[PDB]
Amino acid sequence: TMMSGRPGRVPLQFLPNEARSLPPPKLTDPRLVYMGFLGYCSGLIDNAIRRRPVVSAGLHRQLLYVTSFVFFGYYLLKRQDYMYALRDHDMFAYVKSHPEDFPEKDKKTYGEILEEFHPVR
Amino acid sequence: MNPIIYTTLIMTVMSGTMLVMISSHWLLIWIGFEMNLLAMIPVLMKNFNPRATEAATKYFLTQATASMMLMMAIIINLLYSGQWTITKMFNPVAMTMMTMALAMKLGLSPFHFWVPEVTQGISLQAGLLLLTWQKLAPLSVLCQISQSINPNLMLTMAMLSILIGGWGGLNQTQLRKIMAYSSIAHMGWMTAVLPYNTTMTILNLLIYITMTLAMFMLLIHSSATTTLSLSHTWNKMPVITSLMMVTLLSMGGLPPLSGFMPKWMIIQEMTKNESIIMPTLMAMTALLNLYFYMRLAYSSSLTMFPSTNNMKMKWQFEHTKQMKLLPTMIVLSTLVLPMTPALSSLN
Amino acid sequence: MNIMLTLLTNVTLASLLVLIAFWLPQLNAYSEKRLPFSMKFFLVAITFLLFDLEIALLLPLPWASQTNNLKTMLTMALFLLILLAASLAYEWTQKGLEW
Amino acid sequence: PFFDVQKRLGLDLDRWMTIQSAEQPHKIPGRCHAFEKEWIECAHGIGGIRAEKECKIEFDDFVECLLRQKTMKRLSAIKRQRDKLIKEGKYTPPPHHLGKEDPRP
Amino acid sequence: MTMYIAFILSTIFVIGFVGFSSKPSPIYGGLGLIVSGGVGCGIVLNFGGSFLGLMVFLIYLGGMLVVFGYTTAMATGDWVIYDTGDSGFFSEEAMGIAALYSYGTWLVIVTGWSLLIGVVVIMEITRGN
Amino acid sequence: MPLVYMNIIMAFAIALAGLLMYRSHLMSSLLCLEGMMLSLFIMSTLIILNTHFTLANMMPIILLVFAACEAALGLSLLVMVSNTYGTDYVQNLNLLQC
Amino acid sequence: LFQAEKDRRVLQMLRENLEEEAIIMKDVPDWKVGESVFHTTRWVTPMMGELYGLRTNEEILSATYGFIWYT
Amino acid sequence: PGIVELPTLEDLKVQEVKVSSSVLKAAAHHYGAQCDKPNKEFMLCRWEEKDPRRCLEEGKLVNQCALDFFRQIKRHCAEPFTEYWTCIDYSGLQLFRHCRKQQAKFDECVLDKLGWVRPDLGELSKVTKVKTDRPLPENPYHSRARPEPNPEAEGDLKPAKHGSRLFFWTM
Amino acid sequence: AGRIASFLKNAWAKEPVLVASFAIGGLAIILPSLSPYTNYAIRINRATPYNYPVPLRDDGNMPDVPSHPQDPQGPSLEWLKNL
Numbered sequence A: 001t002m003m004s005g006r007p008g009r010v011p012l013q014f015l016p017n018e019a020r021s022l023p024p025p026k027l028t029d030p031r032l033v034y035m036g037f038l039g040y041c042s043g044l045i046d047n048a049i050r051r052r053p054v055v056s057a058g059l060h061r062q063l064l065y066v067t068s069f070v071f072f073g074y075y076l077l078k079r080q081d082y083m084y085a086l087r088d089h090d091m092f093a094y095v096k097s098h099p100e101d102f103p104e105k106d107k108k109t110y111g112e113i114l115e116e117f118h119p120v121r
Numbered sequence B: 001m002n003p004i005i006y007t008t009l010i011m012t013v014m015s016g017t018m019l020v021m022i023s024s025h026w027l028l029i030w031i032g033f034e035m036n037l038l039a040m041i042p043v044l045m046k047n048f049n050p051r052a053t054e055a056a057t058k059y060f061l062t063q064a065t066a067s068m069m070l071m072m073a074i075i076i077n078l079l080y081s082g083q084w085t086i087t088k089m090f091n092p093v094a095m096t097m098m099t100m101a102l103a104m105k106l107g108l109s110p111f112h113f114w115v116p117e118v119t120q121g122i123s124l125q126a127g128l129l130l131l132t133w134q135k136l137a138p139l140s141v142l143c144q145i146s147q148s149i150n151p152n153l154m155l156t157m158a159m160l161s162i163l164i165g166g167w168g169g170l171n172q173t174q175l176r177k178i179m180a181y182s183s184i185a186h187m188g189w190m191t192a193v194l195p196y197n198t199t200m201t202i203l204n205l206l207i208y209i210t211m212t213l214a215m216f217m218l219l220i221h222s223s224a225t226t227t228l229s230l231s232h233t234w235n236k237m238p239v240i241t242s243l244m245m246v247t248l249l250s251m252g253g254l255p256p257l258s259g260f261m262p263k264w265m266i267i268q269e270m271t272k273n274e275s276i277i278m279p280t281l282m283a284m285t286a287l288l289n290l291y292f293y294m295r296l297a298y299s300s301s302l303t304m305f306p307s308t309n310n311m312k313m314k315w316q317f318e319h320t321k322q323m324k325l326l327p328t329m330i331v332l333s334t335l336v337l338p339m340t341p342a343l344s345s346l347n
Numbered sequence C: 001m002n003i004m005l006t007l008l009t010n011v012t013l014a015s016l017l018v019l020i021a022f023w024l025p026q027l028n029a030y031s032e033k034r035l036p037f038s039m040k041f042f043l044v045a046i047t048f049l050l051f052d053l054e055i056a057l058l059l060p061l062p063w064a065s066q067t068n069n070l071k072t073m074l075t076m077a078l079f080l081l082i083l084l085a086a087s088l089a090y091e092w093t094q095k096g097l098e099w
Numbered sequence D: 001p002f003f004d005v006q007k008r009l010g011l012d013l014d015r016w017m018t019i020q021s022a023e024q025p026h027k028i029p030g031r032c033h034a035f036e037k038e039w040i041e042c043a044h045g046i047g048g049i050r051a052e053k054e055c056k057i058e059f060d061d062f063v064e065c066l067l068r069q070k071t072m073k074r075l076s077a078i079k080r081q082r083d084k085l086i087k088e089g090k091y092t093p094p095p096h097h098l099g100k101e102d103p104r105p
Numbered sequence E: 001m002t003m004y005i006a007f008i009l010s011t012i013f014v015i016g017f018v019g020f021s022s023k024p025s026p027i028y029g030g031l032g033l034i035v036s037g038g039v040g041c042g043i044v045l046n047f048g049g050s051f052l053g054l055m056v057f058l059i060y061l062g063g064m065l066v067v068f069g070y071t072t073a074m075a076t077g078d079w080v081i082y083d084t085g086d087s088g089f090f091s092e093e094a095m096g097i098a099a100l101y102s103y104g105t106w107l108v109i110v111t112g113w114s115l116l117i118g119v120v121v122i123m124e125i126t127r128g129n
Numbered sequence F: 001m002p003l004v005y006m007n008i009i010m011a012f013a014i015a016l017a018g019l020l021m022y023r024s025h026l027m028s029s030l031l032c033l034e035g036m037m038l039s040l041f042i043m044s045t046l047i048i049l050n051t052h053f054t055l056a057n058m059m060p061i062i063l064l065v066f067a068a069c070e071a072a073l074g075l076s077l078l079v080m081v082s083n084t085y086g087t088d089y090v091q092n093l094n095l096l097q098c
Numbered sequence G: 001l002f003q004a005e006k007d008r009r010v011l012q013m014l015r016e017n018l019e020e021e022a023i024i025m026k027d028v029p030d031w032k033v034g035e036s037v038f039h040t041t042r043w044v045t046p047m048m049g050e051l052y053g054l055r056t057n058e059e060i061l062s063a064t065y066g067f068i069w070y071t
Numbered sequence H: 001p002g003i004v005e006l007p008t009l010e011d012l013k014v015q016e017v018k019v020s021s022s023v024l025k026a027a028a029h030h031y032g033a034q035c036d037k038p039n040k041e042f043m044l045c046r047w048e049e050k051d052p053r054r055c056l057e058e059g060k061l062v063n064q065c066a067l068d069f070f071r072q073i074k075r076h077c078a079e080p081f082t083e084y085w086t087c088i089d090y091s092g093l094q095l096f097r098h099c100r101k102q103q104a105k106f107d108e109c110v111l112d113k114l115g116w117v118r119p120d121l122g123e124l125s126k127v128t129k130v131k132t133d134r135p136l137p138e139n140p141y142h143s144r145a146r147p148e149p150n151p152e153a154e155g156d157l158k159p160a161k162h163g164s165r166l167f168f169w170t171m
Numbered sequence I: 001a002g003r004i005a006s007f008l009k010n011a012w013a014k015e016p017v018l019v020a021s022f023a024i025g026g027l028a029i030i031l032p033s034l035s036p037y038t039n040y041a042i043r044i045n046r047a048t049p050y051n052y053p054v055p056l057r058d059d060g061n062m063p064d065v066p067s068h069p070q071d072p073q074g075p076s077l078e079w080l081k082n083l
């Protein structure tokens, strides 16, 4: 595909202004929950490496890890959804503007299509 | 050296890389490469000894030759078209010269010979920096001119790098040479998708950087540079060995680990372009990297090697310094496969 | 042309006179009977090379004074000289100018 | 890869030195200023693939100005034919080309 | 037409390069490189690059090859592609070189930083210990 | 592209080949690198002067400065190697091996 | 005045070259007299070798290196 | 591709100004003061047409005007001008500074005879305007037709249909 | 204030060269931004004609453009003469 050269694109914007027209991801999104799980695993591994009680060494540190992971994951999900929306928009626009390359296939019914039958013996 | 001088040199290396990444003039890219080379040598030679000096002079010779070739390619491109902007190369000969220079900078085969020796000579921190940060600038330059590369040469050197890394990692007992051959193989994987998709190249670069950071930080934590020295790690800090085994399994491309993401996506993208044989050979060859990763895991964590009496004192002491982000790097290099569709962010 | 001829004349005269000096007393018959590698001199040579490079940077100054952007060129020239002085000061304070 | 910091901030760190037709000091023109200007105006906003396929005339003229391969080839052919004719003996140069002409200011 | 003086200088340049590329007795290789640098300076001067040729002949020859020799001593077709008009009442090469302080602010900054870093790097490497 | 450019490119190729030979004497390697940068300087200067591109008269100076700095760095490395082994022989740098 | 004289001199040299070229290349089969090497019809400043290509060596060398060698 | 058109040798015949550089330098200030209109017409045509073959008549006109100027000089102020350009020819740099006396003699002679005032500093370097009947060229560069730009698609963004649609992922 | 005065008096002794160097360098850095003649230098650089002044095509809408060099319209150089 390559959208780097796409027209009217700002050089260092994480989320353009046109991205705000899309529904934001919910706070109960499964991907956000997985990011929180990743942060919790990072906290547990941090506790284990420092030779501390893994489950209950630092509650504030684990909370900070989970919150940071959730925050970054939310913004990443927003950007990903925007990029896929752009891909679909460009696809549909190109299909609209080039009718000769995407003709309507003449619909055909199976009762009048001859398919070879291969017996299993 | 003085910590102020070390910080200034690290900032100069990073600023040279950023100058390469942000400039649109070929002369400025060359200047960024020169600045990075100039500031890199003391970092490699930080712990003064004959081995570090030999590694530094080998690295200097290789990088100076590559920079001279790159300058020659720029001058030929200017000769055949009065252009300084980094765009389409405009000349077949200029493109060939530039590709070889960037391969020499990256260490792609057949220009791989310097990587294992330079990595063995330098310490583990210099090895981490050399194998992680020193790949950004040449890969970015290759990405900017990916539409000009001849696919035959790029694919040939990529497959050669994969084969060379797989074969050369089998023969090593030193951990740094193993990491160097792994880096060569991963570079070969990265450059086999530039003709088709640069997003896959960047995704592979990010995944490999995370995995390599995790592995080098684990090796620094348990100060071992040989297989037998790492075989003593279970008797003091078994958690480090278990995490290292999981990271090694991830680096071998075994699903559902994070390391399966780049190979999967690259194979899928290459198949979209009616290329079938090369991904099959590439996976077959990556089996060798997985094999020597498994040998390291066997020697490290899955079995218990004999220990020594003097480990009883080491049992009584704790690490004075704890490396931040080690936990984050392990998790990111282990458990990010379900987040695969996030690559559309043009990472 | 003129410069080539002048250099050729200088070289020819020097060669002729040196050779006659070395061969006039060669016609009459007579009897006809380490490691140290001081590091300081190398540092002096390297410092000379670096300062010569910065001087080469400073050389286009006589023509840079007619640019209509006097403030910018003054700032840049002062910046170059300040970094030259900074290099000298750094090598001074790091015991790089001692014997 | 490429982070367009200059275009984001409008800095112009190195764009002034990229092309011949971009504000030389004292308005000194490049030798091939017109050809490169025409080629750039042809290919602006069109994209690399279309610029290569459609603006080939302008780029060919620009390369001809830059390296002058065709002009030198033509001059060499003319001089070779003149040499052949003067060796054979049916052509004599005019006084204009023999140094016997009358110069003008 | 002096039998292609530029061609003769180019052949002398290439011959000198073959001379010191054989790498005999590095002092003799340095002498060959000195001859090659002088021939290249002559080429640039005859082309019209007075200041750039003088920069070659001064900086390269008198500093870098001199330091090389010092360190060694410690140890054991043309005339056709030319222009037609004139330049005005100045030399375009000098104007373009002097534009470094009015146009090349970025270049001056990066080059000065690189030179200072090179000084620091030389000091750190030569400390030893 | 006339014959002078071909001669300079041939000089660059000869210098590169001489660098890649390594009979001995790393000082000769540095000499070959400096010959390469000198050839680059000459050929870039000819290109820039021929086309009357005024603003690239800077670039040869920058190239010369940076390459001479690299030369100083290489000389320092060679001096350290020689102080380590007593000679600048190439074959003495065999401690690290593939 | 210098600009006008320069234009007239260049045009005269081009015309003389065209005349001698037409005389010389009369018997070449595929040759065309006064054919441009550019696709565009815009006026292009001639090279040094376009004006003095058929002239004698002394004034070729003059027009090429006189200013450089004048000291 | 095409034939280069050149004017005949007859079109390039004109009565040349056969005076040397010293005479021209001595008379330059009054020459610019008096012969400004044809010179500016010629130079405006020269930077507008970008073609020497389109500016021959103006060159003949400026030659004629310079000839008339020098004929007036010969008719009225021959000998002061002769001494002045004798100065200017003697010097290797042809400096005005060396015999300001002869310059004053020539200036007062021309002021008395033809009523000419020498231009002051900064006057001959001014940018002037030219009233000309020559039509403005429409395509001096002989440019072709520019290729049409890309369609520039625009609209309101909609969510991606069935999400990423990457393998088994439902989002 | 006393410490700075003592430092300056101690540096003026046994190190006069460095004191003079720093004084001259600081003065060279500072004074140009305060002198009023730097604008005069810029204006002088503006008034040096290296190029031919190309005339403009008159359309009856340029009262500020002189028709002849002797016309009062256009920039003047009397200030340069008075300098």
Ligand SMILES: CCCCCCCCCCCCCCCCCC(=O)OC[C@H](COP(=O)([O-])OCC(O)COP(=O)([O-])OC[C@@H](COC(=O)CCCCCCCCCCCCCCCCC)OC(=O)CCCCCCCCCCCCCCCCC)OC(=O)CCCCCCCCCCCCCCCCC
Binding pocket: A040, A041, A042, A044, A045, A048, A052, A053, A054, A055, B238, B239, B242, B243, B246, B256, B301, B334
């Ligand atoms: C499929 C996805 C779904 C599942 C995800 C799978 C992964 C999940 C977890 C990921 C990682 C996060 C946690 C790991 C931290 C490591 C700490 C550790 O070692 O454990 C010690 C610790 C107990 O020990 P301790 O008393 O604290 O102190 C002992 C010292 O820690 C140290 O004791 P020691 O040093 O004396 O003992 C040494 C020992 C200790 O060394 C270790 O055990 C190291 C830990 C393994 C490495 C982890 C790698 C990172 C993640 C990779 C996951 C791979 C999955 C992919 C599938 C392939 C499988 C390999 O090492 C050895 O014995 C050497 C031989 C090793 C044997 C072979 C190695 C195989 C390792 C592969 C493990 C992969 C799965 C991990 C599952 C969790 C394991 C804890 O375990 C825990 O208690 C933490 C476990 C999780 C806590 C859950 C609490 C939440 C429940 C309450 C809320 C309910 C939730 C639901 C909400 C709704 C209800 C209302």
Ligand SMILES: CCCCCCCCCCCCCCCCC[C@@H](O)O[C@H](CO[C@H](O)CCCCCCCCCCCCCCC)COP(=O)(O)OCC[N+](C)(C)C
Binding pocket: A004, A010, A011, A012, A013, A014, A076, B202, B203, B206, B207, B210, B332, B333, B336, B339, B340, B341, B342, B343, B345, B346, B347, D001, D002, D003, D004
């Ligand atoms: C191991 C997995 C990857 C981890 C990556 C490191 C995590 C920490 C990084 C913290 C966030 C860094 C983002 C920087 C903030 C602003 C970024 C913005 O300004 O830049 C944009 C760029 O945004 C970034 O590229 C997005 C980075 C997001 C990385 C996540 C993708 C990882 C792949 C899927 C694995 C799931 C990982 C989830 C857990 C972290 C615009 O780029 P643009 O100037 O226009 O063009 C340059 C790029 N081109 C050339 C390729 C087109």
Ligand SMILES: CCCCCCCCCCCCCCCCC[C@@H](O)O[C@H](CO[C@H](O)CCCCCCCCCCCCCCC)COP(=O)(O)OCC[N+](C)(C)C
Binding pocket: C069, C072, C075, C079, D023, E102, E103, E105, E106, E109, E113
């Ligand atoms: C924005 C973010 C700032 C913080 C991050 C800084 C990153 C590293 C520092 C390097 C960046 C510095 C920015 C300088 C960019 C150069 C362009 C800008 O400065 O404008 C110039 C103006 O020049 C300024 O005067 C430069 C002043 C800055 C240099 C002085 C100090 C530099 C120090 C920077 C770091 C170097 C090492 C550290 C030293 C302590 C152009 O002048 P102008 O005349 O309009 O246009 C010329 C074109 N003409 C001829 C057609 C008209």
Ligand SMILES: CCCCCCCC/C=C\CCCCCCCC(=O)O[C@H](COC(=O)CCCCCCC/C=C/CCCCCCCC)COP(=O)(O)OCCN
Binding pocket: C082, C085, C086, C088, C089, C092, C093, I011, I015, I018, I019, I020, I021, I022, I023, I024, I025, I026, I029
């Ligand atoms: C802000 C302006 C910056 C630009 C101007 C500078 C241009 C050139 C000057 C810089 C050159 C490099 C300076 C290097 C500094 C080296 C410092 C040093 O180490 O010197 C000390 C000795 O000197 C010192 O004490 C250090 C510096 C002392 C202070 C110098 C002057 C400080 C400021 C004075 C002027 C203030 C402003 C002037 C106002 C005057 C009123 C008009 C050691 O000397 P030794 O060789 O070891 O000999 C000692 C054995 N007998």
